[PDB]
Write a protein that binds this ligand. Structure first.
Ligand SMILES: [Mg+2]
Lengths: 186, 228, 319, 228, 228
DNA sequence: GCAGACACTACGAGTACATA
DNA sequence: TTTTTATGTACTCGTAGTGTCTGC
């Protein structure tokens, strides 16, 4: 900045006035906050018997049913809507779930399985190599573990872990680590 | 050892047939499609001195394209492969040979029951017209004493009735009558001239294209008719 | 007093209000809009309402008309990233030699596939805010990214109070009466206008459309009232047969509605919902869901609908 | 019958108006956009010797570009279009006449309400300035004795009041006052000098461009004004 | 008034520093980058008779090229820029001053801490070898008497150690060393011989290039070594 | 007369929906 | 108070690669 004066502009003004569209793209990606949802305002109405009209709100049978399926008191209604409610309207689905699900303040955290990304990768590798289903692959993994041939088999299969395969293994970019984990597999 | 850019451009074409390739000691490379509908071979200049199986050939060639042309390629001490060039060094995992589909045996193509030739310009015109006329199959036959290639759109013409394209390749001189059908999807060859050897016996047969870089053999379609 | 555009032949397009005072809005919304027009400068505004025909585009243009702004009306679906890089920058950076505030109206900008462009727009707002303002209108507010919603005054149309609704409906009755008088439509019974207003609320566009449709013979009398207060797709015969447990009439009605099974089942559930006990609501939705789930599975469809009728007639507890 | 390059360029320009064309035996070709915005007629050197409808004119011109310029176009024995080249032959499908939107008869333009003339240089300057200032609509009107074309950008200027371009053709000795708005998208003609006829009768109107080889009728915009 | 092709060429070169420009009445043009890192000034022949801010200079110069060389330039009654030709007229918009960045005053270059000169051959060779070897950062330095300009690659080398190119200009007389690092992004000058002045103080610095038509001032990077 | 400009296509990302 | 099932199909947007013609 040769001109040592200037009130100085923000990054957006510098990007736009200069018409450097890469700086404009970065400034726009600055606002790339993502993932907005208000499904739990609907579920609360189902749980707390609040008044709530879905004639103007977005509805999700999968999200509503999976949220209500976290507590056994609602499992009868979720089961019924999972059997005979698939061909119902979203309004009808919501109406039934309000009429049937018993009242209760039950909000909590969903039950999610925490997986060994390395073990998932090993099972997927064994299923790809031997063209078997998932449980057959797990049985192969058990047999190769209790035989000591697993380091040998993993060594023979280390070349099969392409960078697209790791996308199927796990979306966490820390997948790079497993990559090195598989590079050092001897 | 380094891979000259002609070797790299050839391997990029060999990746169009098979996603991986197995390189064995010698000045000769080959690959075949996993379904066995096309196979390729090529005598290459750069000497291959150690056997190495590459499962991901396109990613390997992307690694190659980045770090110079005089890149020294070898196998690493641990068991993988190494690519060193002045400023950098990259390690690539060496796959087990059983993880890559290899043609195992160099197919000795029999003495051709029909021989012809096709220039690079003729092949380019044929590919352009096929991209234009939606042509997906070709039929090499003998028409009025010459050897012709008729291009059909098998989708809208399941029986190959209406000829959409026609090309002449010279006289035949022989005494046999044939109609070798070739699906255009099985021709992964790079532009250039090609000596075309069509062989058939009973229910078996093949079409070999000897080019200025590599030879590509392709399998005929099911309802090909000949009288050899 | 009323705004008439002689270029338009469609009634709802001919009588589009041109001033904030002419629009029929909630009291607080109209107060805020009058304040905006009085203070002279227009901020960045987002007018949204999922219910169509409440007045978003009308109010945007009326704000621009009251402020006497240099308005650039743009179809939101055409406001792609190149439009922001080009026409919007060209309009923002152009010098104004008349003191008119520059305002960009982006009508119906709630397309998800434009999110990226919207992000660019946000950055645009941080560079040319001193030169121009933006009035976005939308139906799906979630189609507008969160930074845009946060940077603007977000006004939710079609969300009135009960007294607001009474006042708005009286104003709409008066406006339809004035439209009839301008159009040469004789009003023999104001109950027709009242029924139209109450039936098509809060969609005013659809209200004027219904007025144009039912005012075909030029007179709004008791016949048009009976036509408006009617339901042409009413299912009442099936509902009354179920209420009476009339097996003969249900057996007769099964083939009448068996042709459009999906639509009839939907409408029948929708109608039974409001006329039965909560536990009857549970049972009705279970019965209807099962019967519809086995639609393509059953052999005789008319028999399937009669089976549904028998189930409902037996298990329903009508309030 | 060969196709001189002028004929093929004219056919391309016509293809920009309608994806398909219906050309009958003679030396007269015509086309009209499916949305009825522009119409074109022209005489050309090459002689059409058989009636045939082309569904995809652009692809036909592509396959024509794919062979020698002296290629022979005829009607195949099956009824399609046979393009005979040196060694190759291309068979292009003949479309069903009902599946191509074409004018029924050459529409005779009425007696003009105003007449002027556009030099090819003025038209080229107008097009290049339209690329420049991004003007998307024009207005043929009168400016103190002369006939002028005003060029507006309807995206940023919706009322067509901020004139971005102005061109002066000839003078207007009549007594009428008119303002014919034309959308730039409907200017599908090739460069050249054009006698510009303008017809309007209350609600009806059109703008004809007479060239030495082709005539182009263009529909005016709905909100044009005149007192004829 | 008009604009000669050399004036338009100077403006087109200035457009590489800023997409817009500010013109005040006189015969002196100038511009600044938005980040203030580079600057340009020029004494030119043609006369400026009305102040105006231009939003897009490149399109303006293109539109000037679309008309004749004797195109009259003036200010329309609405405040924009009128460009009158023989029969055509262009109305280019005038920009708001708050949307274009302009140097508020001609910069006063201080006493030159060091001086040298550059022949046009050295400049064109430097530009070509930078484009070739991918040089992104340069630095002026003193060796055993002569002043030279070296160039590395700041991306591959954050410490500035590998001298990938160097060029010799003249001899240095003095007692102080100076290794000034400058980014290539602020290097937009037309080819020719330039009298190079260099000023430094404390962590700040500048380099002026005086030419026959224009002068170009370039800032220095933050961690530049001064020793003054 | 050849860089550059203009247009066209191929592909990744994001969204949406039906059915199981 | 939390928050996403697999497969197949369809659409839109942005951009980058690519081919091809042309203006001082
Ligand atoms: Mg609207």
């Amino acid at each position: 900045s040769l001109f040592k004066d200037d009130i100085q502009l923000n990054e957006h003004q510098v990007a736009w006035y200069s018409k450097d569209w890469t700086a404009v793209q970065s400034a726009a990606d600055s606002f790339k906050e993502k993932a907005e949802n208000e499904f739990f305002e609907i579920i609360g109405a189902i749980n707390n018997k609040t008044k709530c009209s879905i004639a103007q709100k977005d509805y999700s049978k999968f999200m509503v049913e999976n949220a209500l399926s976290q507590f056994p008191e609602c499992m009868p209604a979720v089961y019924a809507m999972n059997l005979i409610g698939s061909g119902l309207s979203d309004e009808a689905h919501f109406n039934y779930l309000m009429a049937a699900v018993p009242r209760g303040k039950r909000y909590g955290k969903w039950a999610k399985l925490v997986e060994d990304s390395t073990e998932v990768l090993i099972i997927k590798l064994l299923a790809k190599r031997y063209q078997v289903n998932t449980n057959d692959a797990i049985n192969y993994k058990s047999i190769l573990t209790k035989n000591g041939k697993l380091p040998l088999v993993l060594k023979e299969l280390k070349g099969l872990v392409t960078d697209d395969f790791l996308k199927e293994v796990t979306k966490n970019v820390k997948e790079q680590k497993q990559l090195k984990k598989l590079a050092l597999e001897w | 050892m380094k891979l000259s850019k002609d070797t790299t451009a050839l391997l990029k074409n060999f990746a169009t047939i098979n996603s991986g390739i197995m390189l064995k000691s010698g000045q000769f490379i080959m690959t075949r499609a996993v379904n066995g509908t096309t196979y390729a071979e090529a005598n290459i200049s750069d000497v291959i001195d150690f056997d190495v199986a590459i499962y991901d050939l396109n990613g390997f060639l992307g690694i190659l394209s980045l770090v110079n042309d005089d890149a020294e390629i070898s196998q690493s001490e641990d068991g993988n492969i190494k690519i060193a060039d002045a400023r950098s060094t990259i390690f690539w995992p060496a796959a087990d040979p059983s993880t890559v589909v290899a043609p195992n045996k160099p197919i000795p193509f029999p003495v051709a029951s029909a021989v012809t030739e096709i220039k690079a310009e003729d092949l380019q015109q044929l590919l352009r017209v096929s991209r234009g006329l939606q042509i997906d199959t070709i039929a090499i036959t003998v028409k009025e004493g010459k050897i012709v290639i008729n291009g059909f759109n098998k989708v809208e013409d399941s029986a190959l009735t209406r000829v959409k394209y026609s090309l002449t390749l010279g006289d035949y001189d022989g005494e046999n009558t044939f109609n070798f059908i070739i699906n255009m999807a099985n021709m992964k060859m790079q532009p250039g001239n090609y000596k075309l050897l069509l062989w058939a016996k009973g229910k078996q047969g093949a079409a070999k294209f000897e080019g200025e870089h590599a030879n590509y053999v392709v399998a005929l379609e099911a309802d090909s008719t000949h009288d050899f | 007093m009323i705004t008439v555009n002689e270029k338009e032949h469609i009634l709802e397009q001919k009588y589009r209000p041109s001033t904030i005072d002419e629009c029929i809005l909630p009291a607080f919304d109209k107060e805020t809009f009058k304040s905006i027009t009085s203070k002279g400068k227009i901020p960045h505004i987002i007018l949204h309402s999922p219910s169509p025909g409440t007045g978003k585009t009308t109010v945007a243009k009326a704000l621009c008309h009251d402020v006497n702004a240099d308005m650039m009306f743009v179809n939101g679906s055409d406001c792609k990233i190149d439009f922001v890089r080009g026409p919007l920058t060209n309009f923002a950076s152009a010098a104004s030699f008349d003191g008119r505030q520059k305002v960009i109206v982006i009508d119906e900008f709630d397309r998800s596939g434009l999110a990226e462009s919207q992000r660019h727009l946000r950055s645009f707002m941080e560079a040319y805010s001193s030169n121009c303002s933006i009035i976005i209108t939308a139906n799906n507010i979630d189609g507008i990214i969160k930074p845009l919603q946060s940077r603007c005054r977000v006004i939710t149309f079609g969300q009135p109070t009960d007294e607001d609704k009474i006042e708005m409906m009286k104003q709409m009755i008066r406006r339809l009466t004035e439209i009839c008088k301008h159009e040469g439509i004789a009003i023999a019974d104001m109950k027709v206008v009242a029924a139209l207003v109450k039936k098509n609320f809060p969609d005013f566009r659809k209200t004027i459309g219904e007025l144009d449709s039912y005012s075909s013979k030029g007179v709004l009398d008791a016949g048009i009232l009976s036509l408006v207060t009617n339901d042409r797709g009413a299912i009442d015969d099936v509902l009354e047969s179920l209420k009476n447990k009339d097996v003969k009439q249900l057996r007769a009605l099964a083939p009448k509605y068996a042709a459009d099974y999906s639509w009839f089942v939907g409408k029948l559930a929708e109608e039974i919902y409001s006329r039965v006990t909560p536990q009857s609501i549970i049972r009705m939705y279970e019965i209807v869901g099962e019967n519809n789930q086995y639609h393509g599975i059953a052999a005789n469809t008319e028999l399937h609908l009669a089976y549904l009728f028998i189930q409902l007639a037996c298990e329903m507890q009508w309030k």
